[PDB]
Design a protein around this ligand. Structure first.
Ligand SMILES: CCCCCCCCCCCCCCCCCC(=O)OC[C@H](COP(=O)(O)OC[C@H](N)C(=O)O)OC(=O)CCCCCCCCCCCCCCCCC
Ligand SMILES: CCCCCCCCCCCCCCCCCC(=O)OC[C@H](COP(=O)(O)OC[C@H](N)C(=O)O)OC(=O)CCCCCCCCCCCCCCCCC
Ligand SMILES: CCCCCCCC/C=C\CCCCCCCC(=O)O[C@@H](COC(=O)CCCCCCCCCCCCCCC)COP(=O)([O-])OCC[N+](C)(C)C
Ligand SMILES: CCCCCCCC/C=C\CCCCCCCC(=O)O[C@@H](COC(=O)CCCCCCCCCCCCCCC)COP(=O)([O-])OCC[N+](C)(C)C
Ligand SMILES: CCCCCCCC/C=C\CCCCCCCC(=O)O[C@@H](COC(=O)CCCCCCCCCCCCCCC)COP(=O)([O-])OCC[N+](C)(C)C
Ligand SMILES: CCCCCCCC/C=C\CCCCCCCC(=O)O[C@@H](COC(=O)CCCCCCCCCCCCCCC)COP(=O)([O-])OCC[N+](C)(C)C
Ligand SMILES: CCCCCCCCCCCCCCCCCCCC(=O)O[C@H](COC(=O)CCCCCCCCCCCCCC)COP(=O)(O)OCCN
Ligand SMILES: CCCCCCCCCCCCCCCCCCCC(=O)O[C@H](COC(=O)CCCCCCCCCCCCCC)COP(=O)(O)OCCN
Ligand SMILES: CCCCCCCCCCCCCCCCCCCC(=O)O[C@H](COC(=O)CCCCCCCCCCCCCC)COP(=O)(O)OCCN
Ligand SMILES: CCOc1cc(CC(=O)N[C@@H](CC(C)C)c2ccccc2N2CCCCC2)ccc1C(=O)O
Ligand SMILES: Nc1ncnc2c1ncn2[C@@H]1O[C@H](COP(=O)(O)OP(=O)(O)OP(=O)(O)O)[C@@H](O)[C@H]1O
Ligand SMILES: Nc1ncnc2c1ncn2[C@@H]1O[C@H](COP(=O)(O)OP(=O)(O)OP(=O)(O)O)[C@@H](O)[C@H]1O
Ligand SMILES: Nc1ncnc2c1ncn2[C@@H]1O[C@H](COP(=O)(O)OP(=O)(O)OP(=O)(O)O)[C@@H](O)[C@H]1O
Ligand SMILES: *[C@@H]1O[C@H](CO)[C@@H](O[C@@H]2O[C@H](CO)[C@@H](O)[C@H](O)[C@H]2NC(C)=O)[C@H](O)[C@H]1NC(C)=O
Ligand SMILES: [K+]
Lengths: 326, 148, 54, 50, 388, 356, 56
């Protein structure tokens, strides 16, 4: 096998170790509750509400027990809370107060101040629990609207001949109907390069120009597009060779598609990697968009399909230099 | 066509007159149906003539092509263009057949829609007629005339 | 749009007038009355059947 | 077949006796139809010559 | 006097629970209301939310066994509503439990097919669980009612027993359909959902005669023609609008079918000069699978069309009797049960049956017409290619 | 029966050729498809897409992004159905316990003062909406009654939470569904400062201006590479000829998006001969940016065809300097007038500089 | 316990705010009363959503 910098999907399989003691404060656990799944959030909240109702139900029952009100036998002593004769009645009263149903069959009385104090506690806890529940609902609802990972890249990239000059090339596609405003392509070479002063950087990332018309990283994806970088003297791929195609060869190409989705209005990222074995020399991307009377048609089945074309199986240093001689 | 149209339209109006006479309530129930029926009739006519005309046009090339293939069979085969002419026929035959198939689909759509409308009339005529005979003592023969 | 509206004209007055003018005065009214007379009897025989069966 | 059987069940032996007239007159219509096509062919031959 | 579900018999004493609640005929009827009320409430917001097209055209397995089951299930539910209304004619009490459970069952059945149709177009089989947890929910309670009618020895003489015994089988039959969808698509609690894709014929945007690729009800109603007819009224029909015919009807595909029939007809029969008998056998073998379908629809259509005259005979015969005295004559368990011999004697019931039979007859007759036409048009394409 | 086709003659006919009718509507329709519409509604057939699975979150998201009248109907139906469904089961429990039975003081009903389904509907309304009148209330020793009360409250809380979340996100996002950005229907190619420039006008119909407006212009052409490459909709980015070479544009009064067609520019070979409608020469201008009020990035693309580009025309001046402020006559916004200008090709224009 | 417009004003206060004292309550045999109770509850809930949404 061979170690990878970022997975093909974009999982970015890297290992972190020897990290100092993280804060691990209390405020982060709430974020854990925020990012829970729909079945788990429902289970967490049903448990929280049920526990609150049950916990207060126990304490109302204890108060009625302490006052000696649930003992059989009618007396002149007015109970702290009326119409309480069991724990089931105590549970119902706790439900009524906390959910604020307030039937009125069992009602608080001016008998003991302990009931008044604990009624305040139940209402405030009930109000704060609803606030937490509503706060978590707002945060989780945005996650549903997120729908982040829906971009497509070819399983293998090519090195082809565009405008006569050799260029690295990959394909990008947007499966989403919605547009991605402010799109940006970032191409990087992840290599192990040595410096003439002895420095050996383990994972060097070199920026790669996109060879756009304006000399910028901005693109516009409505139809699947070819993103190509012209391999020239100003690129680390100028010393490429056909021998640099083994699986365990020291090379990697990272393509990043930043850009805010128009509908959601939040930035999304789509990282993809192309290993040496996933770089195919002497291949070209088949045209996809076919003109139709109704609307332009795009064949997504052939998104990754390639056609073999004879290209110079030489080195760019020798190929470009030979152009002057030729 | 003129004789069939006159008889068909006269039979139709005769039927509605009898059902309205049998049950006056049907007159009220004739207002919705006679509204939607017109829409069905109006749209189908525009969809028919075009389709019918299109069908006739699409028959002209196919049959003409057949005549050419026998008047010039020697030249057709000499040029080694039999495969292209076979493909030309298949396009011609497909064009004519789909023109005819859509016309039948238009005919069937009208027939089913009018059949449902007539079925609704039967329910309306039956319901009103039984109600009239059970309470207002309508003639039994009149109920039969309305349903028939 | 304009052509479709012009194309989708049944031209009833022109065609009816041609048939009416060619048919004349006697054989045109006779057909209208005869066809109507035949169908009014058909309604009548069913209606008479209802009264008799009643 | 279903029609004549149902007619006998409803009106008895009178519907079958009466309905035989329409059944027996259908072959007469067949002769008229076959000769109508022959007359159409004669007109078509003359019209095509014209 | 107030509208009572069970009724107002003996000072509203039909609501008793003693001797078991399940032994109360009103309660088992009420239990039947619940699954229908559940589905109505559960899926109503769902249909309100969702409120090329080739990617949303895949048909679930058993696409025909579901619609025909629903229609027959709709028919028996109409009969149940009609029978229940007959049953409360005797007593002064409304006795709402006789028909309202069955009545909204028909309403719930309509929503189930609407909800299923939405899932059929929009390929989201994961939602086809509500119907599953409904069908068994609509089956279990119904079986309880059936067994209870067997517990009181109702027998097949009563019409309600026959309808309930038939209606439980219909619920059972489509319950098998729902789990059959699960087995093929394997989306619930399964590991690898089997990949099902729309037919390649419609993938091209050059198919507009989408008669093979449409729901069964619209197959018999030609509802897909509404868009084309409405479009025709504005844009005149050109060959661009009528995109080419699907692969099932293409001239080349037809010729392949005609050619393969000839090989079968000439191989075994060595002494086959390809004469009249050989050609006729070739035509029969090539297009028999559709001619028989046209004949089956046509024969059924002829039989149903005769029910109209019988319905008129029944309606007018009941009306000619000036007595106009109607009664079910029996009360099995405090609720009057009508018999089949009187269910088809009521004028209103017979009129409703006549309307339903007319709907079925006209659909079958027109369906037979199109099947014959399609075979006839397809043969013309094949015959012309062979002659050329 | 009543049809003209009682017997079909099927006789052959001899009708000579007559194809062309008076109406030219048969050949009138000659429009060519475009991958971006004039109103910015791009439409490209994404045929044959791999069947990505559908999830219930999509349905939930569709609820959030629905319209206003539809949201009211969905939630009113949701509230009414929730009350009705629970009222039905409340009626069941009372019926199964004998509460709905005629009067008897010995037994204690699972719900007090529940008589009919009308009371059951009212009891469910009181419990779910938490009105809690108290005439009809829960009692003890009926564990099913306690269980359903818990279930109804939990269900009611989740339904109310969804309604608040849907309403809360509706006001935030649905406000940013308006596109008040207008381009020019027809662009021009004029002669400014001696160099040819492709120009179009864009304005803002909202008082609050778009913050950090970025303009992207791309020529879309089926440019087959000389080496052999063929691409159907190749996009070539075009510079802006701004004051700094960047893509930043200030939008207060509508301005002209003028790009000087030079050797670097692919429009160096633009000619009025290749300006006809059936030529593959289309311009896409995209003005991205964020509106200050809400903060959501906005995009408004427009497509200009060769037939929609008017060679040798000048945009009418718009901003008049009044005594106090500046007057903008938006009526003459996208109106272009002719002007005596060279009509040769920008590639051929290089000879004029060489000759001089 | 409805005796004047003041009592009716108090009942609407109790229902829309969802207090429900219980002195004035909705009974049966008056379907029109039930229907407006549903309408008033829905209107009150939608107003609260607007108020909560506007506050946000
Ligand atoms: C006690 C209760 C008893 C009740 C008894 C009576 C109740 C009956 C109700 C149910 C009606 C049953 C309808 C059966 C439909 C069977 C369909 C059938 O067998 O053909 C199936 C096929 C469909 O595939 P295809 O298009 O041929 O396939 C493409 C091509 N052949 C290929 O190679 O792949 O062929 C077609 O299907 C061709 C299309 C024609 C469609 C015909 C069916 C439409 C029915 C419409 C009914 C309207 C509703 C009326 C019901 C009223 C109830 C209230
Ligand atoms: C004291 C009482 C208080 C009561 C108050 C409320 C109590 C809440 C209990 C907590 C659990 C409740 C779960 C509710 C889930 C709400 C919505 C939700 O989160 O669904 C989402 C998930 C998964 O489903 P999906 O998204 O459709 O998945 C299909 C597709 N692949 C997709 O991912 O989009 O979640 C699911 O939807 C779950 C998937 C399970 C799949 C099983 C299918 C059948 C389910 C029903 C039958 C269960 C099995 C039989 C049990 C028999 C027991 C005797
Ligand atoms: C939901 C209830 C309906 C279902 C009932 C079955 C469950 C058992 C509950 C039970 O027995 O409660 C009993 C105790 O119970 C307690 O005190 C429980 C303490 C723990 C409760 C939380 C468990 C988690 C009831 O106790 P009581 O009514 O207080 O008994 C004395 C009062 N009396 C004699 C006047 C009646
Ligand atoms: C009273 C009935 C008369 C009409 C009977 C119609 C039967 C249809 C069966 C059927 O469609 O089978 C289905 C499976 O289902 C089975 O295989 C069912 C096998 C048991 C059937 C037992 C009798 C009910 C196959 O379903 P499908 O392949 O999705 O249907 C093709 C759909 N298409 C034609 C639109 C492409
Ligand atoms: C929307 C708002 C209107 C609210 C007013 C409703 C008026 C009463 C409706 C009605 O007829 O209820 C009746 C039944 O009714 C049912 O059982 C209906 C079941 C329907 C389920 C879902 C329908 C949707 C009332 O019957 P009951 O509750 O059985 O009465 C008890 C009998 N007792 C009074 C003699 C003791
Ligand atoms: C801030 C606080 C004030 C809160 C109280 C407001 C009203 C108090 C005044 C009052 O009693 O109104 C009276 C007048 O009222 C009417 O007749 C009202 C008519 C509609 C008014 C709509 C306002 C716009 C009540 O009128 P009533 O209900 O017809 O009285 C019933 C008569 N009885 C009590 C003798 C049976
Ligand atoms: C929520 C849906 C409604 C729930 C209804 C209440 C549940 C049953 C309450 C207990 C009760 O009194 O009924 C028992 C049976 O009930 C039942 O068996 C009811 C079954 C309802 C679901 C099936 C009594 O038992 P019994 O004396 O009738 O038992 C002998 C026969 N098994
Ligand atoms: C929903 C699906 C409804 C399907 C049609 C229901 C047909 C009901 C047939 C029985 C019927 O009409 O009974 C009559 C009550 O009518 C009614 O109440 C008809 C309206 C009820 C359905 C709407 C009482 O008359 P009867 O049938 O007892 O006797 C009269 C002849 N002699
Ligand atoms: C016979 C008894 C009366 C039948 C009345 C209803 C006729 C229409 C039935 C519904 C139907 O055909 O379903 C869809 C019609 O779509 C629709 O447009 C359904 C509109 C329903 C209005 C009620 C077919 O949908 P599809 O498969 O053709 O298309 C799917 C994507 N559009
Ligand atoms: C283009 C013809 O395509 C069709 C083809 C058919 C199938 C068919 O048996 N047809 C002949 C019948 C023969 C015996 C005359 C016919 C033709 C014209 C009018 C009525 C009829 N009869 C049909 C059977 C019932 C009584 C009347 C139906 C309808 C059509 C149609 O779209 O019009
Ligand atoms: N593993 C780590 N986990 C967390 N923070 C780290 C870690 N490594 C470095 N940092 C942060 O980066 C700074 C520089 O790292 P360095 O290795 O110089 O640490 P240091 O000399 O121990 O620093 P100090 O004494 O300021 O904590 C640290 O001061 C700390 O803030
Ligand atoms: N038609 C398509 N629709 C959607 N995504 C596609 C399509 N074709 C390819 N992809 C995506 O591109 C990548 C692989 O591209 P390629 O054309 O090689 O597909 P493939 O060989 O079918 O891949 P795999 O077996 O991984 O699904 C994957 O991320 C895949 O999801
Ligand atoms: N005063 C204005 N107010 C709003 N939008 C305007 C105004 N003037 C022009 N536009 C918009 O600018 C575009 C075309 O600009 P132009 O000034 O050429 O208008 P036009 O020729 O009248 O356009 P159209 O035929 O589309 O109405 C269109 O999208 C149009 O809506
Ligand atoms: C159900 O109603 C019937 C009505 O026939 C009751 O039978 C008799 O009803 C009359 C009044 O209608 C009473 O005076 C008799 O006492 C009833 N007979 C008996 C044996 O009770 C029947 O009792 C009722 N069922 C009950 C009350 O459970
Ligand atoms: K409250």
């Amino acid at each position: 096998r061979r170690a990878r910098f970022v997975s093909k999907k974009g999982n970015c399989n890297v290992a972190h170790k020897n990290i100092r003691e993280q804060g691990r404060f209390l405020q982060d656990v709430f974020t854990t509750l925020v990012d829970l799944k729909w079945p788990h959030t429902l289970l967490i909240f049903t448990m929280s509400f049920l526990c609150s109702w049950l916990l207060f139900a126990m304490v109302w029952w204890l108060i009625a027990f302490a006052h000696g009100d649930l003992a059989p036998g009618e007396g002149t002593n007015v109970p702290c809370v009326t119409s309480i004769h069991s724990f089931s009645s105590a549970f119902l009263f706790s439900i009524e107060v906390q959910v604020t149903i307030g039937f009125g069959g069992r009602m608080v009385t001016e008998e003991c101040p302990l009931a008044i104090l604990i009624l305040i506690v139940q209402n405030i806890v009930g109000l704060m629990i609803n606030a937490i529940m509503l706060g978590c609902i707002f945060m989780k609802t945005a996650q549903a609207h997120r729908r982040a990972e829906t971009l497509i890249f070819s399983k293998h990239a090519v090195i082809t001949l565009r405008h006569g000059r050799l260029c690295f090339m990959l394909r990008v596609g947007d499966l989403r109907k919605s547009m991605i405003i402010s799109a940006t392509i970032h191409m990087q070479v992840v290599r192990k390069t040595t410096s003439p002063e002895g420095e050996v950087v383990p994972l060097h990332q070199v920026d790669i120009p996109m060879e756009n018309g304006v000399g910028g990283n901005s693109i516009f994806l409505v139809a699947p597009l070819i993103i190509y970088h012209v391999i020239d003297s100003n690129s680390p791929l100028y010393d490429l060779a056909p021998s640099d195609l083994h699986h365990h060869q020291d090379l990697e190409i990272i393509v990043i598609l930043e850009g805010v989705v128009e509908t959601t209005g939040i930035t999304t990222q789509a990282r993809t990697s192309y290993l040496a074995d996933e770089i195919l020399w002497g291949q070209r991307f088949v045209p996809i968009v076919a003109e139709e009377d109704g609307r332009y048609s795009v064949d997504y089945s052939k998104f990754g399909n390639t056609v073999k074309v004879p290209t110079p199986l030489c080195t760019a240093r020798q190929l470009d230099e030979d152009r002057s001689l030729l | 066509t003129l004789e069939c149209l006159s008889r068909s339209t006269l039979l139709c109006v005769s039927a509605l007159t009898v059902i309205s006479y049998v049950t006056p309530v049907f007159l009220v129930a004739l207002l919705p149906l006679a509204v939607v029926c017109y829409f069905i009739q109006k749209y189908f006519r525009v969809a028919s003539r075009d389709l019918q005309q299109l069908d006739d046009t699409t028959q002209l090339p196919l049959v003409s092509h057949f005549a050419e293939t026998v008047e010039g069979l020697t030249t057709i085969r000499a040029f080694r263009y039999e495969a292209r002419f076979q493909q030309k026929l298949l396009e011609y035959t497909d064009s004519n057949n789909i023109a005819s198939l859509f016309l039948t689909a238009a005919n069937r759509w009208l027939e089913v829609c009018m059949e449902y409308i007539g079925a609704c009339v039967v329910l309306i005529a039956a319901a009103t007629s039984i109600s009239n005979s059970l309470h207002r003592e309508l003639s039994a023969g009149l109920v039969g005339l309305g349903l028939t | 749009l304009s052509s479709v509206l012009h194309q989708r004209a049944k031209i009833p007055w022109r065609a009816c007038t041609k048939y009416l003018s060619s048919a004349g005065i006697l054989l045109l009214s006779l057909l209208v009355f005869s066809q109507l007379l035949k169908h009014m009897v058909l309604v009548a025989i069913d209606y008479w059947l209802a009264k008799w069966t009643d | 077949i279903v029609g004549v059987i149902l007619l006998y069940y409803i009106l008895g032996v009178s519907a079958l006796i009466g309905a035989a007239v329409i059944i027996l007159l259908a072959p007469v219509q067949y002769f008229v139809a076959t000769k109508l096509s022959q007359a159409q062919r004669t007109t078509l031959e003359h019209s095509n010559e014209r | 006097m107030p509208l009572a579900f069970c009724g107002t018999e003996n000072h509203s004493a039909a609501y008793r629970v003693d001797q078991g609640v399940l032994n109360n005929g009103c309660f088992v009827d009420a239990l039947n209301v619940v699954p229908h009320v559940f589905l109505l409430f559960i899926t109503f917001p769902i249909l309100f939310i969702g409120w090329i097209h080739h990617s949303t055209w895949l048909h679930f397995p058993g696409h025909n066994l579901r619609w025909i089951l629903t229609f027959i299930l709709l028919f028996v539910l109409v009969c149940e509503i009609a029978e229940g209304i007959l049953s409360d004619g005797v007593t002064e009490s409304r006795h709402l439990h006789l028909y309202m459970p069955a009545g909204m069952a028909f309403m719930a059945a309509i929503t189930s097919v609407v909800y299923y149709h939405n899932i059929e177009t929009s390929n989201f089989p994961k939602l086809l669980i509500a119907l599953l947890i409904y069908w068994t929910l609509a089956f279990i309670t119904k079986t309880i009612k059936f067994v209870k009618f067997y517990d009181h020895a109702i027998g097949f003489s009563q019409l309600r027993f026959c309808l309930t015994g038939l209606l439980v089988i219909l619920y059972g039959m489509l319950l098998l359909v729902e789990v059959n969808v699960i087995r093929v698509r394997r989306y619930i609690f399964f590991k690898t959902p089997r990949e099902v894709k729309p037919p390649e014929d419609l993938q091209d945007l050059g198919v507009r005669f989408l008669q093979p690729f449409v729901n069964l009800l619209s197959k018999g109603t030609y509802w897909w023609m509404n868009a084309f007819i409405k479009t025709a009224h504005k844009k005149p029909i050109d060959l661009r609008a009528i995109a080419k015919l699907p692969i099932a009807m293409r001239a080349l595909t037809n010729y392949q079918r005609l050619c393969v029939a000839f090989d079968a007809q000439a191989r075994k029969d060595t002494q086959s000069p390809q004469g009249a008998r050989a050609i006729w056998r070739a035509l029969c073998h090539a297009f028999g699978r559709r001619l028989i379908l046209s004949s089956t629809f046509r024969i059924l259509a002829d039989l149903l069309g005769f029910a109209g005259p019988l319905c008129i005979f029944g309606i007018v015969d009941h009306l000619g009797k000036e007595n106009h005295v109607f009664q079910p004559k029996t009360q099995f368990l405090g609720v009057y049960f009508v018999s089949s011999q009187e269910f088809l004697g009521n004028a209103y019931v017979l009129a409703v049956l006549l309307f339903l039979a007319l709907l079925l007859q006209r659909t079958f007759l027109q369906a037979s017409y199109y099947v014959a036409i399609e075979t006839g048009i397809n043969l013309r394409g094949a015959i012309q290619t062979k002659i050329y």
